[PDB]
Short mmCIF file of C-alpha atoms in Angstrom, two decimals:
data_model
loop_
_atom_site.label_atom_id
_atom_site.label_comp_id
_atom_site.label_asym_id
_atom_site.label_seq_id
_atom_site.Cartn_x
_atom_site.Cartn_y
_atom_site.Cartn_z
CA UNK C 1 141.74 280.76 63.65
CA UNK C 2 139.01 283.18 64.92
CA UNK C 3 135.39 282.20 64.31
CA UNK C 4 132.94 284.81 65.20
CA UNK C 5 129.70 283.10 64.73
CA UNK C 6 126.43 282.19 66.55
CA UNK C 7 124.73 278.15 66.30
CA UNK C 8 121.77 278.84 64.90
CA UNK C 9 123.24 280.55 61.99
CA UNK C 10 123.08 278.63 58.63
CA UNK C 11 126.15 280.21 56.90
CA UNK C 12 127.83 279.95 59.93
CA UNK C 13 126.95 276.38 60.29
CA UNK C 14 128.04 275.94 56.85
CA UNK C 15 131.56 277.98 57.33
CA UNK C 16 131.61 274.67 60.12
CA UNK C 17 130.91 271.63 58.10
CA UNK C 18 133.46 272.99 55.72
CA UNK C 19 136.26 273.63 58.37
CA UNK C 20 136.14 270.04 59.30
CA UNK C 21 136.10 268.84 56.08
CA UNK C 22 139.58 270.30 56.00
CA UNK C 23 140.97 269.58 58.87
CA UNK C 24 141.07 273.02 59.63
CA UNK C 25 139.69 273.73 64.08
CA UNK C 26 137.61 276.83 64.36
CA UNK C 27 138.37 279.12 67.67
CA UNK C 28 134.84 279.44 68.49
CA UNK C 29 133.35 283.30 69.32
CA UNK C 30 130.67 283.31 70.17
CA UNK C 31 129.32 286.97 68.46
CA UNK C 32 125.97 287.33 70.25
CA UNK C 33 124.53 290.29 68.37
CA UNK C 34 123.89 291.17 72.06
CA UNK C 35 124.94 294.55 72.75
CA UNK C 36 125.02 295.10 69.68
CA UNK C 37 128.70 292.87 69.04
CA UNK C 38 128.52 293.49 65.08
CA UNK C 39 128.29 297.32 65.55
CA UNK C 40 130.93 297.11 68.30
CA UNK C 41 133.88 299.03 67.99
CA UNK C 42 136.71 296.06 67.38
CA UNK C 43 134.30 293.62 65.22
CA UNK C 44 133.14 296.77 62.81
CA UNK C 45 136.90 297.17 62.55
CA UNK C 46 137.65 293.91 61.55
CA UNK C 47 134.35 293.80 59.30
CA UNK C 48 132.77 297.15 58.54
CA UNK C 49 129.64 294.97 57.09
CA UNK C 50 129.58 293.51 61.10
CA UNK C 51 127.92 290.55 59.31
CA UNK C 52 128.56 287.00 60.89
CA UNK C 53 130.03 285.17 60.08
CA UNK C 54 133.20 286.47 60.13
CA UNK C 55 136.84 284.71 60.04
CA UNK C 56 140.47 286.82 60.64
CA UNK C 57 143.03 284.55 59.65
CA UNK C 58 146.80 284.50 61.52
CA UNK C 59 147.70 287.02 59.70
CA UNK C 60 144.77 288.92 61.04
CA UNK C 61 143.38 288.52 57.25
CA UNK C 62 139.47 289.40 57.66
CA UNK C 63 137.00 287.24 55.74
CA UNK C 64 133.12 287.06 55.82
CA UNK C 65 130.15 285.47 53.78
CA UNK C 66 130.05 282.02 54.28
CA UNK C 67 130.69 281.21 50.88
CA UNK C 68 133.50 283.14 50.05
CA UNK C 69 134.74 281.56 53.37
CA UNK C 70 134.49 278.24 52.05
CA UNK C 71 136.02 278.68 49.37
CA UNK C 72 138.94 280.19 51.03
CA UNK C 73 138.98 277.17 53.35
CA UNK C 74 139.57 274.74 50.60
CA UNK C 75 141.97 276.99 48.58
CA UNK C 76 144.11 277.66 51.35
CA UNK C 77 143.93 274.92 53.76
CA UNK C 78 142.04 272.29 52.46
CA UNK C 79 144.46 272.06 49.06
CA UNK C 80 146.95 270.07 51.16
CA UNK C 81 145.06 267.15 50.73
CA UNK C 82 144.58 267.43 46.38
CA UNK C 83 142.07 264.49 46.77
CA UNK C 84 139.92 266.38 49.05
CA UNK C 85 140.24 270.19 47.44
CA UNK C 86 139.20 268.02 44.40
CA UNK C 87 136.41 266.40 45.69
CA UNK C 88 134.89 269.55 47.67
CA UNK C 89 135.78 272.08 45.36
CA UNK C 90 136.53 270.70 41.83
CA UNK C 91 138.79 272.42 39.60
CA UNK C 92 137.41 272.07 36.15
CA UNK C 93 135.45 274.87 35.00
CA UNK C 94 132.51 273.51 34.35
CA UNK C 95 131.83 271.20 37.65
CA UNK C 96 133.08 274.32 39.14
CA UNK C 97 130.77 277.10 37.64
CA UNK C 98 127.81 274.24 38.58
CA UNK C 99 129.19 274.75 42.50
CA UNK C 100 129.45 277.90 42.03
CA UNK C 101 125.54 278.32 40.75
CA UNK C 102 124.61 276.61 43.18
CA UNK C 103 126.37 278.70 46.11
CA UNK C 104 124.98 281.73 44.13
CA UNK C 105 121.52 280.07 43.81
CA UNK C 106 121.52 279.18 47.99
CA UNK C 107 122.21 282.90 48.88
CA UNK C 108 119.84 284.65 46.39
CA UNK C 109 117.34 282.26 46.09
CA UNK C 110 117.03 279.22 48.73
CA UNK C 111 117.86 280.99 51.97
CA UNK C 112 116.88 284.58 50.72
CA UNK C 113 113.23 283.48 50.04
CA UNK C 114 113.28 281.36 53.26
CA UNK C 115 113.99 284.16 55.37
CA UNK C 116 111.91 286.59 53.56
CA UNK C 117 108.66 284.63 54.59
CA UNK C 118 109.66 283.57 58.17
CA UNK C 119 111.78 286.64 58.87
CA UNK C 120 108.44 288.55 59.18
CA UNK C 121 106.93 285.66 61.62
CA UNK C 122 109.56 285.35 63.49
CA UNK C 123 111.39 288.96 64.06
CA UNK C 124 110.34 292.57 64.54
CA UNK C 125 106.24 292.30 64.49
CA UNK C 126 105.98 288.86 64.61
CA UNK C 127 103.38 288.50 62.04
CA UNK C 128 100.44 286.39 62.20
CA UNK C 129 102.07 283.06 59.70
CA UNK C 130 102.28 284.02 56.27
CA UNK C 131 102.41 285.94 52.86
CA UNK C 132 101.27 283.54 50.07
CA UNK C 133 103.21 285.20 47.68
CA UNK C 134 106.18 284.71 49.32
CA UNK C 135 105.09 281.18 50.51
CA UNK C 136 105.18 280.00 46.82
CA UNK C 137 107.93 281.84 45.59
CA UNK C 138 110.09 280.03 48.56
CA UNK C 139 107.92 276.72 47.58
CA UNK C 140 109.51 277.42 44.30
CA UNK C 141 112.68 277.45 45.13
CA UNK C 142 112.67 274.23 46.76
CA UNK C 143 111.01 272.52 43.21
CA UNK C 144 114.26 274.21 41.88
CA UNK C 145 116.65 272.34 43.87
CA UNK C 146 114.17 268.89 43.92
CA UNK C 147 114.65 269.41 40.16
CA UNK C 148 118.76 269.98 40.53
CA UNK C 149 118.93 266.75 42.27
CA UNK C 150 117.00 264.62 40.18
CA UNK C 151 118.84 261.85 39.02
CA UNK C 152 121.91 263.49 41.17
CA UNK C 153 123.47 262.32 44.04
CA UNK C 154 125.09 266.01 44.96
CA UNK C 155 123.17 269.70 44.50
CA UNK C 156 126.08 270.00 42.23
CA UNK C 157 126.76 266.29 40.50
CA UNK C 158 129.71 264.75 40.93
CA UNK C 159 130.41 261.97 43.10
CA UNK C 160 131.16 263.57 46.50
CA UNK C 161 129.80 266.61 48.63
CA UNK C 162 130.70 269.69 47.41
CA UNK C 163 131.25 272.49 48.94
CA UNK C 164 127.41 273.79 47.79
CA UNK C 165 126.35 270.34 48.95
CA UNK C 166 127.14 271.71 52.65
CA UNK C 167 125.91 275.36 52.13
CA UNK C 168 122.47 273.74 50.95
CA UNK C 169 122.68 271.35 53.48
CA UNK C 170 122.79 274.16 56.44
CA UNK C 171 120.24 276.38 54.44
CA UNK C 172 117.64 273.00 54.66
CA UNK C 173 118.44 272.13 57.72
CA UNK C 174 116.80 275.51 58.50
CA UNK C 175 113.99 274.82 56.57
CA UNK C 176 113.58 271.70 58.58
CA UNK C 177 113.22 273.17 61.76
CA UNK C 178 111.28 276.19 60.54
CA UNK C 179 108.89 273.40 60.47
CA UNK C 180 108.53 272.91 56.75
CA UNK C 181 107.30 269.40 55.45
CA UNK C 182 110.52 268.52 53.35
CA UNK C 183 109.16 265.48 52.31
CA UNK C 184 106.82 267.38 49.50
CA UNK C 185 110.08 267.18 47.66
CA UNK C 186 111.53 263.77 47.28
CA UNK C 187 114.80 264.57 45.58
CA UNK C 188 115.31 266.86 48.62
CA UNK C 189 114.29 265.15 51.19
CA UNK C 190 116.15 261.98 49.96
CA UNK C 191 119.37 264.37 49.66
CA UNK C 192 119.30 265.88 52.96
CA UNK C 193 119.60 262.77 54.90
CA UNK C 194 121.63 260.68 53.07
CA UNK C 195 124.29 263.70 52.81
CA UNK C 196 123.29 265.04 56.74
CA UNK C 197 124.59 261.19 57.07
CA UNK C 198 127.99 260.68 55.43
CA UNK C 199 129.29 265.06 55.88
CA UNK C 200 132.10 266.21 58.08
CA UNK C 201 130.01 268.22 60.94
CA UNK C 202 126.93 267.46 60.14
CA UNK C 203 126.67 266.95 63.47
CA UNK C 204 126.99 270.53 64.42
CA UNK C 205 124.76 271.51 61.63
CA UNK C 206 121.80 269.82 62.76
CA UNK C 207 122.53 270.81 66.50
CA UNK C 208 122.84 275.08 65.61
CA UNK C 209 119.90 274.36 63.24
CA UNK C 210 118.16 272.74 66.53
CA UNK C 211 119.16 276.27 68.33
CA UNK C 212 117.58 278.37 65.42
CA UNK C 213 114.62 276.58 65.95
CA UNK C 214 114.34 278.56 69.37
CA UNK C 215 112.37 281.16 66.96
CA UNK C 216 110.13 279.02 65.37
CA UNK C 217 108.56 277.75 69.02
CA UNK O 1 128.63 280.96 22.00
CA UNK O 2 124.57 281.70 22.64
CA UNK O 3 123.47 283.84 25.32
CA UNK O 4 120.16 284.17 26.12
CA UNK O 5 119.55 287.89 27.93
CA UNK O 6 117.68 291.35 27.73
CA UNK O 7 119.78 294.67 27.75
CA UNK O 8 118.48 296.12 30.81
CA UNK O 9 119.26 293.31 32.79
CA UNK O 10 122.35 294.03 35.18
CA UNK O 11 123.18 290.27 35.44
CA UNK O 12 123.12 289.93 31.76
CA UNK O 13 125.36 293.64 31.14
CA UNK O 14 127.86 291.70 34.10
CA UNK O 15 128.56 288.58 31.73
CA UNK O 16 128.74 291.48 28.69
CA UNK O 17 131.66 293.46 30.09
CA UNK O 18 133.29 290.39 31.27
CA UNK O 19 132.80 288.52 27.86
CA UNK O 20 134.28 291.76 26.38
CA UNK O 21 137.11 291.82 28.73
CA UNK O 22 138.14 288.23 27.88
CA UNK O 23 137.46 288.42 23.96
CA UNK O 24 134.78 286.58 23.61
CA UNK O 25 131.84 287.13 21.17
CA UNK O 26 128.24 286.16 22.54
CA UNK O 27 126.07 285.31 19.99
CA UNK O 28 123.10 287.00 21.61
CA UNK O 29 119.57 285.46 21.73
CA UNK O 30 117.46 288.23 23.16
CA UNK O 31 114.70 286.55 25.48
CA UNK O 32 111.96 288.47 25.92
CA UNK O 33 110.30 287.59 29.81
CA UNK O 34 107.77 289.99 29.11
CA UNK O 35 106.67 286.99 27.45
CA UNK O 36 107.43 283.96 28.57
CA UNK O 37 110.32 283.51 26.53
CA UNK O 38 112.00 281.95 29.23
CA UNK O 39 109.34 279.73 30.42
CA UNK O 40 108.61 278.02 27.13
CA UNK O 41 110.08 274.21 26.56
CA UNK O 42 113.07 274.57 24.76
CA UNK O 43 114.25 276.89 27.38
CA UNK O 44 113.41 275.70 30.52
CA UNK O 45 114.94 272.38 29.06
CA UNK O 46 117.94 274.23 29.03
CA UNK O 47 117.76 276.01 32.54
CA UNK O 48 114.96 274.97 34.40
CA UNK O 49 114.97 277.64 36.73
CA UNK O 50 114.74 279.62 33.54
CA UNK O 51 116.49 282.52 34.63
CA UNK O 52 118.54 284.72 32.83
CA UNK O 53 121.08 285.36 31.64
CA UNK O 54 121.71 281.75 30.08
CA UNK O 55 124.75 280.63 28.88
CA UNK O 56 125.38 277.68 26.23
CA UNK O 57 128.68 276.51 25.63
CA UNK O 58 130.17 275.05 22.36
CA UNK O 59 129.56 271.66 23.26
CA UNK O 60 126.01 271.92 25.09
CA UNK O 61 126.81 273.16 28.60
CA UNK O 62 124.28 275.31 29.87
CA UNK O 63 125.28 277.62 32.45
CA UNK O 64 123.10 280.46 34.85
CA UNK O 65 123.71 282.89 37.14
CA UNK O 66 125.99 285.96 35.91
CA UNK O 67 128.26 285.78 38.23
CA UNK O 68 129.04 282.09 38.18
CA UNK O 69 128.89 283.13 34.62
CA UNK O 70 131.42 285.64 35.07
CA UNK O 71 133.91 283.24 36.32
CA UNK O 72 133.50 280.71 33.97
CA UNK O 73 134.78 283.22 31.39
CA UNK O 74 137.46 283.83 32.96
CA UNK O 75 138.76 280.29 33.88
CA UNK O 76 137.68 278.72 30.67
CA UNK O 77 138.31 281.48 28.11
CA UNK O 78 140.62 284.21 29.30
CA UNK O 79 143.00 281.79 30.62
CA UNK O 80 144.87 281.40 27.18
CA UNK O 81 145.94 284.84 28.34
CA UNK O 82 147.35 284.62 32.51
CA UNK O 83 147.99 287.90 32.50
CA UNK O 84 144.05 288.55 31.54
CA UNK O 85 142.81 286.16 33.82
CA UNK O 86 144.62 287.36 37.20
CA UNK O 87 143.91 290.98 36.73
CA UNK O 88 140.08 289.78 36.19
CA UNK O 89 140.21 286.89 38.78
CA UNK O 90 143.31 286.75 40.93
CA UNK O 91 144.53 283.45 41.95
CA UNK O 92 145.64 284.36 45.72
CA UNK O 93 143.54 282.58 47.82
CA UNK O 94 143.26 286.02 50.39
CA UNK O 95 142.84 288.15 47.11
CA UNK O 96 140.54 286.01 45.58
CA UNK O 97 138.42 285.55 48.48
CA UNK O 98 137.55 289.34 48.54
CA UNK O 99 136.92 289.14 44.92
CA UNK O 100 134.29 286.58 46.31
CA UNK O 101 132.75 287.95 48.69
CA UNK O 102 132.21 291.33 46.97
CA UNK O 103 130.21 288.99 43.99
CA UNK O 104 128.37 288.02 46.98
CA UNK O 105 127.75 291.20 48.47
CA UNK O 106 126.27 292.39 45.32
CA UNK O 107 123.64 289.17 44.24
CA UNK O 108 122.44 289.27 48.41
CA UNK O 109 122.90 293.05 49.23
CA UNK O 110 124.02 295.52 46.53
CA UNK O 111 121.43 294.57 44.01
CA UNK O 112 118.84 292.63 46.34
CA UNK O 113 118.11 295.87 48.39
CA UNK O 114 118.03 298.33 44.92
CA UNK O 115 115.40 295.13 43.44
CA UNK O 116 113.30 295.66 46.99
CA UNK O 117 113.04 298.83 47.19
CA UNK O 118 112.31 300.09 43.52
CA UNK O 119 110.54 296.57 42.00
CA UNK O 120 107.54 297.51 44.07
CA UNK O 121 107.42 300.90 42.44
CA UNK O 122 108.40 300.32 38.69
CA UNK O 123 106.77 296.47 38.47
CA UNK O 124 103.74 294.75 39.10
CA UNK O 125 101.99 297.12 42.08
CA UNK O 126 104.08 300.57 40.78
CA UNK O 127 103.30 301.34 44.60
CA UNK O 128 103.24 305.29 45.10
CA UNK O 129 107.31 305.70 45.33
CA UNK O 130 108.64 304.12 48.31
CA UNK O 131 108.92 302.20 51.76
CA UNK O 132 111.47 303.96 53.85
CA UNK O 133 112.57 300.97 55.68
CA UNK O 134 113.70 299.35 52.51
CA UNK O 135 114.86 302.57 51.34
CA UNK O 136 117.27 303.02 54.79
CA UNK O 137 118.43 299.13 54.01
CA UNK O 138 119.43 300.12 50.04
CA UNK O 139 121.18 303.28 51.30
CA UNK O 140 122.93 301.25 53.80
CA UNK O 141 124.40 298.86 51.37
CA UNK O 142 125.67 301.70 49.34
CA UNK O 143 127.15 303.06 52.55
CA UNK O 144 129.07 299.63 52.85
CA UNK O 145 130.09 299.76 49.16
CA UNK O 146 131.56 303.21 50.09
CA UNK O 147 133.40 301.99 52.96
CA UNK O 148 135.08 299.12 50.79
CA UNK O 149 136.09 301.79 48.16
CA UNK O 150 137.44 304.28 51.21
CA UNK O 151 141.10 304.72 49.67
CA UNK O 152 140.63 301.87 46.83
CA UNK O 153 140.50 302.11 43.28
CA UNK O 154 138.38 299.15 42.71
CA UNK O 155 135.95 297.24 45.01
CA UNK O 156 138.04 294.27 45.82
CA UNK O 157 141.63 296.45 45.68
CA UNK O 158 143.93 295.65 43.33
CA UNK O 159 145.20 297.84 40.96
CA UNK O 160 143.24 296.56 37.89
CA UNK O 161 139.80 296.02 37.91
CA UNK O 162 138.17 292.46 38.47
CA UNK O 163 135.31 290.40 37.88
CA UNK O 164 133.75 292.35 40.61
CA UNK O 165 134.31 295.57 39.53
CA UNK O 166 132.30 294.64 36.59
CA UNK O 167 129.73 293.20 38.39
CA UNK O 168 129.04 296.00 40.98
CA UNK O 169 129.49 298.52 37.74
CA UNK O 170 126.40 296.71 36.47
CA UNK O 171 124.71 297.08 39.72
CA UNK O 172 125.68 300.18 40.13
CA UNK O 173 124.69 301.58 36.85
CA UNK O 174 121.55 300.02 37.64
CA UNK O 175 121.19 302.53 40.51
CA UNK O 176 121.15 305.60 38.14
CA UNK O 177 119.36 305.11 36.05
CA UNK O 178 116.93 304.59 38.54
CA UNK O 179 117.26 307.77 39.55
CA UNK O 180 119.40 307.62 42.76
CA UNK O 181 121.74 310.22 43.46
CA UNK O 182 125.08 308.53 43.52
CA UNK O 183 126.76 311.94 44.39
CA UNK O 184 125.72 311.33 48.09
CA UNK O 185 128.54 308.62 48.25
CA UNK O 186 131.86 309.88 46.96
CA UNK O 187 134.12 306.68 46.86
CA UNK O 188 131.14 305.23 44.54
CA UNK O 189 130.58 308.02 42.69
CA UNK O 190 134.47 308.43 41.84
CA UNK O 191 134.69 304.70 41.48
CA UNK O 192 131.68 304.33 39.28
CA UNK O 193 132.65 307.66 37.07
CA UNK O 194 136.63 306.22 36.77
CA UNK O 195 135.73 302.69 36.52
CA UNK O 196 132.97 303.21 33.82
CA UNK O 197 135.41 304.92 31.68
CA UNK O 198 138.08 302.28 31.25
CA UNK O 199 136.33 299.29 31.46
CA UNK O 200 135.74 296.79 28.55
CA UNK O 201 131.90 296.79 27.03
CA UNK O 202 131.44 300.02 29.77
CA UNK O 203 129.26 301.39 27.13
CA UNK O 204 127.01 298.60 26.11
CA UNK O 205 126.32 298.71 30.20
CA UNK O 206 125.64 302.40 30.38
CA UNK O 207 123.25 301.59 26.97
CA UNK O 208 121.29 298.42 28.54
CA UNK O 209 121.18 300.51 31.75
CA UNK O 210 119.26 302.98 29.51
CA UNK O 211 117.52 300.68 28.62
CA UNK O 212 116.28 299.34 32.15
CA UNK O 213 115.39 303.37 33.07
CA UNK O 214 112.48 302.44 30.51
CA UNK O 215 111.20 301.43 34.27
CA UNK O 216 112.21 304.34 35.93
CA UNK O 217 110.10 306.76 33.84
#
């Protein structure tokens, strides 16, 4: 199915992880935001938000936000396989409302405060590194998920990835090459490579998050 | 079951409506942040990012994040009813998806750009009214939000309301009473007017939304 994405992007990267967890074989688009491809005629048509990433299904079904993509994923092609819906996506509602927090808690508050101190470094002005406030309140969200994982194998328990596992994982992987000295947070840190190790894709991840590092040079 | 909020927060007047929608009585703890209410032990033991709202189940699960919240509800205590639950959260994997991704929409964009823009103003730094790029940016999002309402009675489609609806309503009611005139996007406008007026715990939202204007004056 259509993938209109870019490599360096996290929930793009984490739309991939979850894909081949499933089985499921992205037809890669690249959307380079180039001529402006989200506010081109077709995309905007498909997705008036002409945010990436963006998936149209064969029925031409339009999808975007990572997370509500992976979800989809594992609900519609990833359930085949019980064991593995199960294990990526549990079913009870209480390990599920714990993924879901934790998706919720990556958007809002992990990747939002990431890019809202780099974004200004890196885009528009460029600014000369840094906003303390911001600084902490990203520092903070990091103690929040060192604090998630500790005594925890998986952002969200459990005894496997989960889909949050692999939205996390893309978000860090972009704190990694931002530069960021993951290892001030041991539960983390230890996370991140042991689940960067055993994850479907993982591969890809740390490769687009390479590519996003392109702005941190 | 407890739940630890403050009227005037949107999040907590999501998980209201929802609660209300599902039958559910909260017994509510109000948690003052003013002071730190939520950063005191037996709290934070609870959530340690010690946001709110807070949920805590019968049997000691402690749950964050409305609109994780939200679905919790619905999959653990409007089920007893199907017909409750897949008006509020339908089960269709395309359906549900957009359901998603509007919750989505709302925690990154919706509310995230009204927070921006106005927080600076009515918190902390009550900065002299405005920042026009931010102000473009919150616009924009309700410009999106109008889109996904063009010829749609709710914000995911359907023909009942859903978990979203409620959200956004919160959100959205959020916006007023901030002072934003809503009449410069008719889909919302009609949606938010309609919507507000059949909706389940509508009023206690308009009330805590009051409540938040506190800000706003």
């Amino acid at each position: 199915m259509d993938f209109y994405y870019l490599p360096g992007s996290a929930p793009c990267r984490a739309v991939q992880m979850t894909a081949a967890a499933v089985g499921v074989e992205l037809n890669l688009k690249l959307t380079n935001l180039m001529a402006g491809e989200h506010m081109k005629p077709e995309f905007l048509k498909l997705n008036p938000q002409h945010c990436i990433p963006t998936l149209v299904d064969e029925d031409g079904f339009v999808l975007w936000e990572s997370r509500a993509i992976q979800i989809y994923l594992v609900e519609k092609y990833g359930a085949h396989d019980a064991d593995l819906a199960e294990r990526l996506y549990p079913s009870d509602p209480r390990r599920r409302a714990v993924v879901h927090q934790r998706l919720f808690f990556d958007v809002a508050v992990l990747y939002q405060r990431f890019a809202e101190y780099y974004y200004p470094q890196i885009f528009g002005q460029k600014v000369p590194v840094g906003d303390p406030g911001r600084l902490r309140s990203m520092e903070q969200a990091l103690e929040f998920l060192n604090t998630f994982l500790e005594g925890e194998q998986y952002v969200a328990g459990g005894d496997d990835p989960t889909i949050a596992d692999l939205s996390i994982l893309a978000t860090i992987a972009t704190y990694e090459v931002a530069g960021y000295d993951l290892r001030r947070y041991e539960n983390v840190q230890r996370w991140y490579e042991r689940t960067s190790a055993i994850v479907p894709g993982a591969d890809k991840n740390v490769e687009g998050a390479k590519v996003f590092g392109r702005y941190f040079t």
